């Protein structure tokens, strides 16, 4: 039959692949704003109260 896409979809051209990746599920991130952040100088320690 003639010449049509379903015959030549991998021989005369290639299917389009969209330029942008759709991101999927992103969780809400807040802890850095929503709490006091301390950059400790030791992995273990005691804070005085």
């Amino acid at each position: 039959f003639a010449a049509s896409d379903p015959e030549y979809v991998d021989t005369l051209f290639r299917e389009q692949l969209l330029e942008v990746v759709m991101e999927g599920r992103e969780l809400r991130k807040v802890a850095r704003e929503a709490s006091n952040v301390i950059n400790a100088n030791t992995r273990v320690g005691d804070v005085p109260i």
Partner: protein
Amino acid sequence: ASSTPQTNVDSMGGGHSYQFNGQDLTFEDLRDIKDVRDSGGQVAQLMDYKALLNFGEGCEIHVEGDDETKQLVDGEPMTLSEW
């Protein structure tokens, strides 16, 4: 270009809270400077010599085209330098 800065600055954060940086200092750190300044001895004398070198020799005020400023201030002429 633009009428406001468009690069960010590090100089924002959780105020005088428990983090450490040169612009994030507390009133205790300010009083620590005051204690070094107050307590005298050799350290205070060196930093006083530094102040005297930078600023102790006195000063002069200039205005470019000062004479052209001449105006009555209070029934008498002055220039901006004289004022």
